[PDB]
Design a protein around this ligand. Structure first.
Ligand code: ZN
Length: 172
């Protein structure tokens, strides 16, 4: 029913995504399936790289109510300061692992929406964390890449265990 999410260390998560050529109704349908997948997980961010569609498309909803959806197509993110903020990040492609990352605290976002309109906004807080995390997906990067090798290694061993439990849960 839902789209499968790739899990670390799947090598396809390292693919650099291609620009979206036109917001066609198949990219519209993909965005809608990404939302269902994301909301089911549950998560607040999913990049199209994570469902093995190597395209610059990101869906996001940062709200308690699952009612404030946002789409970023072909995004450009530029920091507006050297000040960073720590945040404990997770990732649906690194399931059930969370750790601290430090990223620029304020950024400018330029992207297009599901109608092909351009927009430009400035983001701090959770938005700035999340858009930078998701942009990293589109350049083949995961948040575990900023951790020490032992923490990455532990994360990898734990995730294979969770994925193996998830499969076993399908047989029951
Ligand atoms: Zn992620």
């Amino acid at each position: 029913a839902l789209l499968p999410i790739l899990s670390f260390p799947d090598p396809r998560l390292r693919t650099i995504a291609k620009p979206v050529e036109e917001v066609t109704d198949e990219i519209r349908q993909l965005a809608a399936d990404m939302f269902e997948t994301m909301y089911a997980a549950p998560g607040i961010g999913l990049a199209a790289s994570q469902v093995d569609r190597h395209i610059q498309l990101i869906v996001m909803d940062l709200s308690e109510s699952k009612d404030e959806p946002m789409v970023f197509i072909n995004p450009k993110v530029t920091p507006l300061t050297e000040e960073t903020q720590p945040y404990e990040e997770g990732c649906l492609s690194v399931p059930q692992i969370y750790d601290k990352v430090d990223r620029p605290s304020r950024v400018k976002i330029e992207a297009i929406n599901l109608e092909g309109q351009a927009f430009e906004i400035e983001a701090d807080g959770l938005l700035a964390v999340c858009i930078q995390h998701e942009m990293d997906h589109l350049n083949g990067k995961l948040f575990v890449d900023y951790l020490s090798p032992l923490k990455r290694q532990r994360a990898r061993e734990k995730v294979e265990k969770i994925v193996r439990q998830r499969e076993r849960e399908k047989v029951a």
